[PDB]
């Protein structure tokens, strides 16, 4: 019952003896004295001081004709005899940058998640994710202007659908004070961020997604405390969100209700349907070791933060209690154990990891020259080893193009024809191996330069005639589309059975082919040429014969491939390949993935 302290704390309307006004209530048990300070009362805190409930410590008091539009703060003396004016840790909508003062507002309405985007989440799904900064995504060309939420309706939601996305996600959007932190480092945590309009905006928004047939993650940012001035540190001249840098005192029941709660509001009152916490590391580690002794089990020098690890724990709990459906995703960088295994089984009972060591892996070999991927067959080869220790996610995030990492297109090896085949040919093995599928936004159309959260993309490389640009973004459409389509691509993507390798030792050549299959047991070949050296007549066993037909070749003319494949329905020939009794003989084109369908 304390897992909406938002619906009952902060500013919210109220009608007392038939007249109206706002009912305002703040968590700041050592304080001397507060009051609401607004534009109601002309900022003087002297008219409408605040009601101290001692058991709770909560402040309480109701002003009449206070009504949702006006800016207002807390004025406290702190619990030292200070006096500092304090923004609502509950505020719904806040001023923006160096303004921070909360605006009034109650909740909105409570948004019931559809059965549809409940399927959408679970594990069998295809889901595709396409990952935005909202704040650099596009911007009015003349101004250089922010797209509103209400613009961001009218172009993104079109535009990720059409791109056959099944997910958006966002990073955070959570109110905070400067564009560099992306978001991850916020002032206001039930407020999104004015920079793109009002909080009813943003809820057109998702609700405008929503209508297209998209679920939206968002990154939420339980681990980074806001260190800001007017934020939670030292509330009420006490150290009361956070501890004796600045770490959020998890274990103190207001401050878990005050997180565990953020995420509820996010999911049951805007109707997101995912969270994600980036650097999971920063929030279940500490600098310093305990100090105390040696009972630590799981030796990590004892600088685990248990008190943080529980956290994250109970606040999957409950997401599985309470709002069955979402579902919470994580990226971890330690290695540490089980972060998407249930908590029972002692993890951090998050649903889907963030694979941050295949797209390291991946991308290093596809960075090799195509004459050196003969001895680093392994990069590709091991995904699949460690692929049933978490529930995956395939990243390419915001997080790798940026700082000095070049583009997704810029590590690749080639002269320009050569350069763009291995991220057709890449993209494509992304897609058909295990685990879901994260892009950032740009990545789809192969931008070149580093993403700059200061800028709008790179838009204009796609005007003009199409070109080379335009065909990554085309591949990535039928990718999309067709992973989508076939049950076989992701039904068991953590099930052994869903994949099995036909040739993992082509090492040679670098070719690589292997099967996703689905529960019935009908098959789809992947095949892949990952050196510019074109192949014909290549032979491989198979487990089903019949006729085979190529559903997607990377290297076709819209993509700006060779446009060299197969032909047409290929039919298998009986001769010896593997020992699997069945071979096939195939075009592997140049720096081109190859995926066949077996026609009934
Ligand atoms: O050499 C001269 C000059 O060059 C440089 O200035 C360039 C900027 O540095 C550079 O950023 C680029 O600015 C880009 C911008 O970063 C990028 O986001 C992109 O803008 C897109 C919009 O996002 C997109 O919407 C579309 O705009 C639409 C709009 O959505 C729609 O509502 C309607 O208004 O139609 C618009 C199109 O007309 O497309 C644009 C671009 O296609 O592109 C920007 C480029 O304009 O380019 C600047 C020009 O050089 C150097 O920085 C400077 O030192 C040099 O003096
Ligand atoms: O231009 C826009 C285009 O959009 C739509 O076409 C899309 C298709 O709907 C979609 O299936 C996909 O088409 C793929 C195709 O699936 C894939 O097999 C591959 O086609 C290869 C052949 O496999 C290969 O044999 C070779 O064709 C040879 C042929 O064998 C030979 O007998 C002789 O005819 O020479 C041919 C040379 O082309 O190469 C082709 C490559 O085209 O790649 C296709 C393209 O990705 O994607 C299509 C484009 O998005 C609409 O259906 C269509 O009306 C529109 O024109
Ligand atoms: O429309 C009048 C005025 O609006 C804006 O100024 C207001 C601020 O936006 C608002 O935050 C508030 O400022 C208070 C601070 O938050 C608080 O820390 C302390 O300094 O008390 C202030 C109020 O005295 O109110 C002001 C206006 O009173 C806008 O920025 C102005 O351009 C505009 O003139
Ligand atoms: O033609 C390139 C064009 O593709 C997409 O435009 C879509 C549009 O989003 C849909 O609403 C519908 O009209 O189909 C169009 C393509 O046929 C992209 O949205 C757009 O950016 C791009 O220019
Ligand atoms: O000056 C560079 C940038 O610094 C910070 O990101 C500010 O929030 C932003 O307003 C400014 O443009
Ligand atoms: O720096 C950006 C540039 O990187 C590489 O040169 C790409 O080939 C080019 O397309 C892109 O414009
Ligand atoms: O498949 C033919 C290809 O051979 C090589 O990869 C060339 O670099 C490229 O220009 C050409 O298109």
Excluded at 59 to 86: T, V
Excluded at 479 to 503: C, I, Q, S
């Amino acid at each position: 019952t304390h897992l909406r302290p938002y619906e009952t704390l902060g500013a919210h309307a109220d009608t007392m003896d038939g007249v109206t006004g706002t009912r305002f209530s703040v968590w700041a048990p050592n304080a001397r004295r507060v009051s609401v300070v607004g534009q109601f009362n002309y900022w003087d805190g002297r008219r409408h001081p605040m009601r101290l409930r001692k058991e709770s410590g909560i402040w309480e008091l109701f002003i009449p004709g206070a009504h949702n539009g006006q800016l207002y703060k807390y004025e406290m003396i702190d619990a030292n005899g200070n006096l500092r004016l304090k923004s609502d840790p509950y505020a719904f909508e806040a001023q923006m940058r160096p303004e921070t003062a909360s605006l009034i507002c109650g909740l909105p309405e409570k948004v019931v998640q559809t059965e549809e985007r409940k399927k959408a989440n679970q594990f069998d799904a295809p889901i595709s994710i396409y990952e935005v900064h909202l704040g650099s995504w596009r911007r009015h060309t003349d101004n250089n202007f922010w797209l509103s939420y209400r613009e961001l309706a009218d172009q993104l939601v079109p535009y990720a659908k059409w791109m056959g996305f099944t997910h958006l996600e966002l990073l955070p959007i959570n109110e905070h004070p400067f564009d560099g932190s992306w978001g991850y480092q916020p002032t206001g945590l039930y407020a999104p961020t004015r920079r793109f309009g009002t909080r009813d905006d943003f809820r057109y928004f998702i609700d405008a997604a929503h209508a297209a047939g998209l679920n939206v993650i968002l990154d939420w940012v339980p681990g980074h405390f806001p260190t800001d001035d007017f934020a939670l540190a030292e509330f009420d001249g006490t150290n009361l969100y956070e501890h004796s840098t600045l770490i959020y005192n998890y274990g103190r029941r207001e401050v878990s209700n005050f997180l565990v709660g953020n995420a509820l509001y996010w999911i049951e009152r805007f109707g997101i349907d995912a969270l994600r916490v980036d650097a999971v590391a920063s929030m279940i580690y500490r600098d310093y070791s305990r100090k105390e002794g040696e009972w630590i089990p799981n030796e990590f020098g004892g600088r685990e933060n248990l008190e943080a690890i529980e956290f994250l724990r109970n606040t999957n709990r409950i997401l599985g209690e309470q709002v069955s459906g979402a579902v919470t995703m994580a990226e971890e960088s330690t290695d540490f154990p089980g972060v998407s295994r249930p908590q029972d089984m002692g993890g951090l009972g998050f649903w889907y990891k963030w694979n941050l060591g295949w797209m390291h892996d991946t991308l290093d070999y596809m960075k090799l020259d195509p004459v050196y991927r003969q001895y680093h067959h392994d990069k590709l080869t091991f995904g699949i080893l460690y692929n049933y220790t978490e529930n995956f996610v395939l990243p390419l995030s915001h997080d790798e193009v940026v700082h000095g990492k070049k583009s997704i297109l810029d590590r690749m090896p080639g002269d320009a024809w050569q350069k763009f085949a291995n991220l057709r040919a890449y993209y494509g093995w992304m897609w058909a191996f295990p685990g879901k599928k994260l892009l950032f936004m740009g990545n789809e159309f192969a931008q070149g330069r580093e993403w700059n959260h200061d800028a709008s993309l790179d838009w204009h490389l796609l005007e003009g005639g199409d070109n080379w640009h335009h065909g990554v973004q085309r591949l990535v459409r039928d990718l999309n589309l067709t992973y989508r389509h076939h049950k076989a691509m992701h039904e068991l993507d953590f099930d052994p059975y869903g994949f099995e390798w036909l040739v993992v030792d082509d090492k040679e050549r670098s070719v690589l082919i292997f099967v996703r299959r689905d529960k019935e047991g009908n098959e789809i070949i992947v095949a892949s040429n990952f050196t510019p050296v074109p192949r014909h007549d290549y032979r491989f066993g198979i487990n089903q014969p019949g006729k085979w037909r190529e559903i997607l070749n990377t290297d076709s003319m819209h993509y700006h491939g060779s446009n060299a494949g197969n032909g047409g329905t290929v039919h298998s020939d009986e001769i010896a390949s593997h020992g699997r009794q069945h071979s096939l003989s195939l075009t592997l084109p140049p720096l081109a993935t190859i995926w066949l369908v077996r026609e009934a």
